Ligand binder design. Structure first.
Ligand SMILES: Nc1ncnc2c1ncn2[C@@H]1O[C@H](COP(=O)(O)OP(=O)(O)O)[C@@H](O)[C@H]1O
Ligand SMILES: Nc1ncnc2c1ncn2[C@@H]1O[C@H](COP(=O)(O)OP(=O)(O)O)[C@@H](O)[C@H]1O
Ligand code: BEF
Ligand code: BEF
Ligand SMILES: [Mg+2]
Ligand SMILES: [Mg+2]
Lengths: 406, 417
RNA sequence: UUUUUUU
């Protein structure tokens, strides 16, 4: 008997058990309470958020990890006993309430025994590194969607702990690029913990993502205030850090981080100093720490963040935000509006796209092939570049056979 | 028996060492407690204890010996230095101190300093009589700090082009100016390697402010020197205090006639941190910089100088431009009017994967005749006249191909004839 | 007011 499981099952399945014992939120509360009279075990789970007083609540993914009526109370002694912090996934027995359910004991901390999670190294003390193991994006299945992933592997490689972004103007193909990322992440690397954080973007894109991606989708559409965007993103990035502390390879696909930085700018207190474009002089610190959370860890695991970014918006702010994040991350995949307006996809700007320390992600042969191909494409215009590379790649199914044509 | 030596050793060797002394079970308690209990037991035997750290004098007249593992911030193992000890040897903030220590007594929370054995790697008496950094007579850089390895390395190309475009002397006040992803950090790393090989006599420090954390570990495992860092995970308040400790430590070593070099990355972000903590003056410059915000970072950069009495302080720091934020153009141009050397890197050259992506015409060093021989300057002068009409990319492709033909710039000069 | 608007 689990709480969040009762919330998932339809109300019809609920009334069946409730009548046998004797709103949907109340009938669940009545089933759990009457069951507590029997003396049998009752359960609940969630992602922890530690308040200022020292206690915490297990937030629900249904509420985008915000406050909810079905949230479980976590006492400070429980947090101290297992050294819990915000972002930890906690499961265990609870008790009927006083207007809040309360956790009796925790069985699993981050899908693992609670005792093992106590002597772990904190995320801040993990030794950072440049990305070693690479996340190759190519499916090699011969599909038209694979072309996007194949050009990405040549232009800007992605590794574990990468801190990259997809820069483009509106309607250039950022989101669809990111959807193409998710498909290759789940098909090529099922081992990775895939999360998709959608901030201040379209409402049809989260439902499309929820059914397209194999993973978790946390969203906060543009129907939501900027303060909600910040709180939702903080919960997600803290949950990612906790899994990295358990040596997990977490990947966050953010869309968009430029709008996430805007939300911070609208929230930060006015400092009396404003950068070019209307960005407060202290507004970009927290977005830098968010994006900058992605890193490769020597002790094990990694956190990878690939986020979409806006440029050529006519607003100087987004140019400042892009350049700031560029100086924070180590990978950029640019997309040109001129290429996208000619219906040439992917609309990748090859000469601007690139990845730092790409030798740590590529074989020596692969590095030379991409180096030569880099020099050949550079003199061409951006449209002529893609149309040239699309045809050469279309001739073959995989990049390896393309390397052999050279 | 030293505190920081015990902090460096792994916990496994500490527990075994503590059990040999015969102590209550050390496996449960934290590593900090193992060291503390091990230090106390050694004090019970009557044997001496030792500690060390860089001094930071508080407002009340006493100070503490901060440790490098805390980025010279407040630490649990800080050693109290009494005011009488400071007056005896005229100690000031930044002085590296080593001496005998004792565990804290009842009602105390810190290790205390009994006797100071070494002040700035020297006899404590010599520190009493000294000329202060503020009174040292400044000079333009005299002694050349040549970066060229000469080993025919492909990485040496960056050092060779640097020597021709913007020479570096002892006491230089230089800038590696470029937009993001142009090659500033790796060029600073290339400089760090050249300093460790060609100038092991110099005291090398690498200060990393508000930059990537993976570059911190990359730097400390690459350079043969001390690395102090404060990544972008840290607030601006921490950046300032860490930078102030490092710059004062450099001034103290220069007072001992040492040649100190500080590779800072980035100084633009250090200037932003000062602008974050500066008191509002009611006057804001173009780009969102307070009218009084750049005085402190200007004195920091301006600390680099050549000293006639002996020693020097060199600072090679990276700066950002073309960020879309006018603030960084103000910060860069303000530092250019403070320093005397700029090595520009071009995003246009870097996008073509041409490295080092050096803007030759914009780079340069002031009073470079004081750092070059008569014929070396005449050869660099002719080389600039030839390179100037070329484009940014054509200039580097031309110069790198010519330099790659030879191992050293000297042989390259002999080819020019 | 300055900064932002703003080149
Ligand atoms: N790989 C692709 N193949 C075909 N069409 C594409 C592709 N990528 C983008 N597009 C076109 O671009 C339009 C908008 O792309 P989108 O990903 O929403 O850009 P952005 O996220 O930058 O707004 C889509 O309607 C689609 O028709
Ligand atoms: N000398 C060089 N040789 C090869 N690649 C370089 C060189 N300098 C820079 N790069 C490439 O540029 C990327 C970023 O350079 P970096 O030094 O971080 O620039 P910045 O410090 O200005 O951001 C590196 O990851 C590297 O791939
Ligand atoms: F309209 Be796109 F998502 F920038
Ligand atoms: F992004 Be670079 F380090 F300026
Ligand atoms: Mg989109
Ligand atoms: Mg850098």
């Amino acid at each position: 008997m689990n709480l969040t499981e009762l919330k998932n099952t339809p109300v019809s399945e609920l009334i069946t058990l409730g009548e046998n014992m004797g709103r949907k939120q109340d009938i669940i509360f009545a089933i759990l309470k009457q069951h507590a009279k029997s003396g049998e075990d009752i359960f609940g789970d969630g992602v922890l958020e530690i308040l200022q007083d020292g206690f915490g609540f297990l937030r629900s993914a249904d509420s985008s990890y915000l406050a909810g009526p079905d949230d479980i109370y976590v006492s400070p002694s429980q947090i101290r006993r297992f050294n819990l912090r915000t972002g930890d996934t906690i499961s265990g027995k609870i008790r009927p309430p006083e207007r809040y359910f309360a956790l009796l004991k925790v069985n699993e901390v981050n899908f693992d025994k609670p005792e093992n999670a106590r002597n772990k190294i904190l995320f801040e003390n993990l030794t950072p590194l440049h990305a070693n193991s690479r996340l190759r994006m190519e499916r090699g299945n011969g599909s038209t969607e694979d072309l996007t992933a194949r050009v990405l592997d040549l232009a800007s490689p992605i590794g574990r702990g990468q801190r990259g972004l997809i820069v483009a103007p509106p309607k250039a193909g950022k989101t669809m690029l990111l959807q193409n990322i998710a498909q290759s992440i789940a098909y090529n690397h099922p081992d990775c913990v895939l999360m998709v954080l959608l901030i201040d973007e379209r409402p049809e894109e989260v439902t499309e993502m929820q059914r397209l991606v194999k993973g978790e989708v946390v969203a906060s559409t543009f129907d939501e205030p900027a303060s909600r965007h910040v709180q939702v993103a903080e919960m997600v990035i803290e949950k990612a850090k906790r899994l990295v502390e358990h040596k997990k390879d977490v990947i966050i696909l953010l869309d968009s981080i430029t709008r996430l930085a805007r939300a911070y700018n609208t929230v930060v207190p006015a400092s009396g100093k404003v950068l070019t474009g209307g960005v407060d002089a202290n507004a970009l610190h927290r977005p830098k720490r968010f994006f900058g959370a992605a890193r490769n860890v020597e002790e094990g695991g990694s956190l990878t963040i690939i986020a979409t970014a806006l440029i050529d918006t006519g607003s100087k702010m987004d140019e400042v935000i892009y350049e700031e994040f560029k100086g924070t991350g180590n990978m950029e995949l640019h997309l040109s509006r001129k290429i996208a307006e000619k219906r040439v996809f992917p609309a990748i700007d090859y000469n601007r796209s690139g990845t730092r320390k790409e030798e740590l992600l590529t074989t020596q042969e692969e590095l030379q092939k991409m180096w030569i191909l880099r020099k050949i494409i550079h003199p061409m215009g951006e449209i002529d570049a893609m149309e040239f590379l699309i045809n050469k790649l279309a001739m073959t199914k995989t990049n390896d056979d393309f390397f052999e044509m050279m």
